[PDB]
Design a protein around this ligand. Sequence first.
Ligand SMILES: OC[C@H]1O[C@@](CO)(O[C@H]2O[C@H](CO)[C@@H](O)[C@H](O)[C@H]2O)[C@@H](O)[C@@H]1O
Ligand SMILES: Cn1nc(N)cc1-c1cc(Br)c2c(c1)OCO2
Ligand SMILES: Cn1nc(N)cc1-c1cc(Br)c2c(c1)OCO2
Ligand SMILES: [Cl-]
Ligand SMILES: [Cl-]
Lengths: 135, 140
Amino acid sequence: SPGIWQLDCTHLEGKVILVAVHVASGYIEAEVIPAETGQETAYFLLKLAGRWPVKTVHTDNGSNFTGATVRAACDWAGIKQESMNKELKKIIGQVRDQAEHLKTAVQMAVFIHNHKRKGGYSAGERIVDIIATDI
Amino acid sequence: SPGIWQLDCTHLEGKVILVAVHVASGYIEAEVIPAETGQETAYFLLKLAGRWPVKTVHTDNGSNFTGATVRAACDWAGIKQEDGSMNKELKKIIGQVRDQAEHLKTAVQMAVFIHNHKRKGGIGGYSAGERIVDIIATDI
Ligand SMILES: OC[C@H]1O[C@@](CO)(O[C@H]2O[C@H](CO)[C@@H](O)[C@H](O)[C@H]2O)[C@@H](O)[C@@H]1O
Ligand SMILES: Cn1nc(N)cc1-c1cc(Br)c2c(c1)OCO2
Ligand SMILES: Cn1nc(N)cc1-c1cc(Br)c2c(c1)OCO2
Ligand SMILES: [Cl-]
Ligand SMILES: [Cl-]
């Protein structure tokens, strides 16, 4: 379904990276956040939902999803909580040296993941085609 | 046309908001940033080009665009600078929701959500969100 995303956390350099993947397409939105907390999680979900039609997010159901702030954020946005990360960590690696800050490396990796063409469409192309069609 | 964005800065509560608009559709991406510097500007542009096909950005051509870091970022992402109202509507929505948000950044993101989801012209219309995917899908 075009409205389905998966959200997973990954850790590197003592920081926390949230990675949202649009399941149908492989398109990614990711951010380094200061700490894996409900407030930062709610905020990430709020940003994501304002940029793409998010209907359902599948999560790891952990501590940062149980609190008042995250439930509210999802409620407000109309969201229901009913491997790829390895490759992103690979890209972060090959570009890590080109930035002082991890956050910059992560965003370069997001750009690269979403633009890559391996018929032969990028994730960016796939997400737009899947959603346009739904509409 | 589908790859053209405009980027302008807005100030509020002593902070700076960068607002990128997809000219063809009216869809927006916005962020409160630490300060209006080349580094933060480069980073905003890098995030933006990672998420939508940005070919050309129209900017205010100011100090934060003259530096080595922003030029590099644009070069890398493959972005072109060409020539130099919603920013007021967004101002409005932000005010309308400022109350329910602890931090300004939260208000801004609530305003982005609202701006991009709102139905233009009611029934049959199409939100900016819908318009942008429709424009870019068509281009492909
Ligand atoms: O997070 C608060 C504030 O920062 C923004 C950009 O201004 O997001 C950035 O925040 C971190 C800065 O250290 C980065 O790790 C993160 O990846 C980056 O996007 C906005 O979302 C928000 O207004
Ligand atoms: C990679 N690529 N090549 C094109 N012709 C268009 C695109 C493209 C890249 C990203 Br990222 C996108 C997108 C399209 O839609 C939303 O996100
Ligand atoms: C508002 N709306 N109503 C729908 N049925 C779909 C959408 C919709 C909302 C946002 Br934001 C989008 C989008 C579609 O494509 C990328 O960003
Ligand atoms: Cl998580
Ligand atoms: Cl600016």
